[PDB]
Amino acid sequence: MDIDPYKEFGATVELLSFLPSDFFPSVRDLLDTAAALYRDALESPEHASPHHTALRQAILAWGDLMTLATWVGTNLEDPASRDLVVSYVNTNVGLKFRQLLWFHISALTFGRETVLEYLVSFGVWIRTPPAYRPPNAPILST
Amino acid sequence: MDIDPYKEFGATVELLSFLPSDFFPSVRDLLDTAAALYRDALESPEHASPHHTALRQAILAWGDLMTLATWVGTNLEDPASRDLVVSYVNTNVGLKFRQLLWFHISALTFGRETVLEYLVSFGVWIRTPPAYRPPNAPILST
Amino acid sequence: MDIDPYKEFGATVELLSFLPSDFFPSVRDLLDTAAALYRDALESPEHASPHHTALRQAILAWGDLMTLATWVGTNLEDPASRDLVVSYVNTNVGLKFRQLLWFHISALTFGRETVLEYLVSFGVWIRTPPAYRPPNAPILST
Amino acid sequence: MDIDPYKEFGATVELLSFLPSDFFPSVRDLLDTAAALYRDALESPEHASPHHTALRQAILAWGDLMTLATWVGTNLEDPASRDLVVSYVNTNVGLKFRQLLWFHISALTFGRETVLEYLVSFGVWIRTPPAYRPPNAPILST
Amino acid sequence: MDIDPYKEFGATVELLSFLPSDFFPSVRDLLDTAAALYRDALESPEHASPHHTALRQAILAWGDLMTLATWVGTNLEDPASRDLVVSYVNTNVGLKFRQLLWFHISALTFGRETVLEYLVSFGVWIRTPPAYRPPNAPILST
Amino acid sequence: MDIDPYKEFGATVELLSFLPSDFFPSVRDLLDTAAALYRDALESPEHASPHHTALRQAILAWGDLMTLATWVGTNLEDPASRDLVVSYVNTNVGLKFRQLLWFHISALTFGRETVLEYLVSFGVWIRTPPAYRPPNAPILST
Ligand SMILES: COC(=O)c1c(CN2CCN(C(=O)CCCNC(=O)c3ccc(C(=O)[O-])c(-c4c5ccc(=[N+](C)C)cc-5oc5cc(N(C)C)ccc45)c3)CC2)nc(-c2ccccn2)nc1-c1ccc(F)cc1Cl
Ligand SMILES: COC(=O)c1c(CN2CCN(C(=O)CCCNC(=O)c3ccc(C(=O)[O-])c(-c4c5ccc(=[N+](C)C)cc-5oc5cc(N(C)C)ccc45)c3)CC2)nc(-c2ccccn2)nc1-c1ccc(F)cc1Cl
Ligand SMILES: COC(=O)c1c(CN2CCN(C(=O)CCCNC(=O)c3ccc(C(=O)[O-])c(-c4c5ccc(=[N+](C)C)cc-5oc5cc(N(C)C)ccc45)c3)CC2)nc(-c2ccccn2)nc1-c1ccc(F)cc1Cl
């Protein structure tokens, strides 16, 4: 039934609510990072962590919708519909994969612990009111 | 990069091409089967096998396209060309998910070796000349 | 000298005569099956079994006749009598290759003993009087 | 897919490009050599090297096309077509088997090493320009 | 054949396309820089590390092109050192030598690990959102 | 700035100029012989030897000038320019590459000592008067 990817990873789906929209880099940058620094283990036919499994499984989904967005700009003679659909692709759909792809890439580099710790210390950051807040946003580190 | 769905789990996308599209059961069916069997592996925060860890994504990935069918269902003016898309969503873009679900369900329920041993077997049957050919079909045991 | 194709691999050309020509799947089919299964044994420069080492030759041997069909396809004036030849190429001269491919594919995929154990079995079925005779057909397991 | 016989033998198909057309003896001499000095292991139902496997598998192909050339001179009432076809049989088709049969026969007698070494030292021979070239062509030796 | 110059160096041509073109200093700076630190090593008769080997061949490969464009300045008017020759050499082909020279000059200075790390450790810093990142890029330490 | 391309290997430009001009085979032949002999080490992501490193960079250098030979074929319309310019890459500068390609290739297969001896021998052989020079040129040795 209703399942959260973060369940087995010590996280939650509501945990990403604290992260604003622009917190996540663009999807193009998302794939390119994994396509640059992780290409070995991804196409490697022998995974080592579950993140490698979900990641290469997740990249196919986004690569899947890309063909969808390509076809939509092929047979839909309603430019308003092709606008909203293609826009909605980069919208919450794309914003969903961003919330997912970013985690695993952040997961593989730092583990599944510091990414939690950062998201822990980030939400408390944005939790704090404006004036009494450390203006330098917390940096993802190790 | 060019990640492929089925490399570390034995079979590959070249292998599944034997099975015609008509063999794959409807996505409405599979979503209950391994789910009605598995209220735990699809919900426990402690993984057991990469299959359901890979299965969760298509689960999440399916509802997204379903959410797209939901979102598109009202927020588009012309349902005529729209349903042309929703047909494309269920038929084609769901066909790939129809295979991703069918693998891990049968695999997780019958061991990975059985599905590989069955994939080769059915392709043998499908390529045998139908002039005389056994009317048998998928066996699946433990 | 009078070399025979099937001496060291168990079965012999006298044995394969049980199988009528209609049983053998089309060469268009077999060329993908063991190839789609085997991107390595058909490409690795380090052999494993003599089958694919024997299989490569018919692969090369097939394209030659196919190259002959290609070369003949334009460099002959009358395609009427020409296609009489190209029919003879695919039908008869390809029939022998149709058997050479079918053996090693099934043999390399199911062990040499299974095909020998299956060859005798089918001949038993083919010679049983069809007045009452099992409607079964090639089994193939491990 | 596209496969080279020389892949598992430390050679390549492009390696034979250095060898001119007349480098290879006629096919009749090719079979007769194997039909004279190797008849024991060829019809022997227990091979000892992969060359014995590919060789007896290769001889059948050429023996196969011979029946083809025989039939072509039986029902094709176009003498130009029977000319070009039969000529093309002895052409690059036959020149292909010559490149193959010669290697294995040369392989079995000297191993799969000196035949490479010779073809290594032969191409460098023909690589050298005319005037500054050792006029005595390199001899296949042991 | 296809020989990426970074194969025996860890990095690949695709990892280096992960950085913007402006990331690489100008061509003349690298020549003067390398010629301002390794006159004692480049023109030395004996090489210590392979970077000296690749770098020496890298520079002379550049001097030929500059020598090339110079000679082209006396052939014709537009497509000779004016419209296409010096434009293509100085602009297009320069983009790949800028990284060849930069990598080795960067490498031997700080080893090969550090140059491999800095690419990734920088190439994502340019991808991180503006607000949630440090103000200045990282720096090659050791 | 003027770095010896050969100073690492004892020989200098005078020695390869010490031999005649057309003694060096055509550019494509070396790449043929280079690809045939050393298809594996040049693809290998491991530092085989100093010759391999320079040989890879040597080929990629030629790979670029051939690209400009291809670029001029398309984005250059003046036949007086496109033809004459190719005479610089294909004819004028190719000699400078054939010296490198012939040296590094030969040194690998034989050894840096023998190639230097072979330079002196064939360098003095050609200068000996024709009336009393030995019959054949000196031989490549081990
Ligand atoms: C996983 O890797 C990534 O790719 C990655 C990372 C991680 N990267 C790591 C590298 N990185 C660097 O910056 C380099 C390290 C050096 N930096 C430093 O040392 C550094 C950086 C900032 C500060 C900072 O301002 O306070 C300081 C700093 C201090 C640090 C520690 C400290 N004490 C003692 C404890 C005291 C400090 O006192 C200071 C005092 C200052 N005054 C003078 C006022 C000023 C500064 C400081 C140091 C940026 C983050 N994050 C994120 C991300 C994106 C959006 C939102 C949140 N997170 N996304 C990705 C990602 C992106 C795309 C993609 F596809 C995939 C991925 Cl996964
Ligand atoms: C595998 O077997 C085969 O069947 C076979 C062979 C091998 N055979 C072996 C037997 N064979 C002989 O000749 C007998 C051996 C005795 N010969 C010698 O001693 C001999 C032969 C030639 C020379 C030669 O001219 O330089 C020399 C010679 C020297 C030798 C070594 C030497 N030092 C110290 C290192 C110094 C030398 O200084 C000389 C100096 C000279 N001055 C006075 C100028 C003159 C000569 C020499 C010696 C010929 C080759 N080759 C080829 C082949 C065909 C085409 C193209 C290339 N290759 N095809 C086949 C095949 C065919 C069909 C078939 F269906 C299947 C097969 Cl496989
Ligand atoms: C050989 O490689 C290269 O040439 C190279 C490099 C290497 N880079 C170059 C730049 N570089 C530096 O800048 C030095 C570090 C700067 N350090 C700091 O700023 C720094 C960091 C921390 C502190 C700190 O303790 O608080 C301080 C510091 C102070 C800071 C501010 C200050 N107040 C208030 C005014 C007072 C300070 O008082 C101090 C006092 C101290 N005491 C008393 C002991 C000690 C420290 C400090 C400074 C060295 C490394 N990069 C790049 C490149 C390319 C693209 C993009 C980015 N980069 N390309 C190349 C390349 C180019 C072309 C070519 F052909 C080939 C190559 Cl390879």
Numbering used by the authors:
A (entry chain B), B (entry chain A), C (entry chain A), D (entry chain B), E (entry chain C), F (entry chain D): 1 to 142
Give the exact sentences the study uses for this entry:
The HBV Cp is a 183-residue, homodimeric protein. Cp assembles into icosahedral 90-dimer T = 3 capsids and 120-dimer T = 4 capsids. Putative Cp allosteric effectors (e.g. heteraryldihydropyrmidines or HAPs) have been discovered that have antiviral effect. These small molecules ostensibly act by inducing an assembly-active state and by stabilizing Cp-Cp interactions by filling a pocket at the interdimer interface between dimers of the quasi-sixfold.
